[PDB]
Amino acid sequence: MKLDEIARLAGVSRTTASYVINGKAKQYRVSDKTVEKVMAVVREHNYHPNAVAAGLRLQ
Numbered sequence: 001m002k003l004d005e006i007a008r009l010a011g012v013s014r015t016t017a018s019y020v021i022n023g024k025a026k027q028y029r030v031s032d033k034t035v036e037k038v039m040a041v042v043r044e045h046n047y048h049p050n051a052v053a054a055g056l057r058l059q
Contacts, residue, residue: 001045009045010038017042022049 007017020038
């Protein structure tokens with residue numbers, strides 16, 4: 001379930017859905033509106049990013 005389908009199935013764009021796939025919605029401009037909208041599809045299909053991601057400190 002690539003970014004493309006998750007965007008069309010949820011109802012956003014290849015990047016707006018990209019926000020929702022990585023859990024970055026608030027960082028961009030989809031604080032909730034697209035979270036439940038696109039996250040419901042990202043988690044329905046279980047689509048997640050690959051290993052090794054920037055965040056060694058993470059607070």
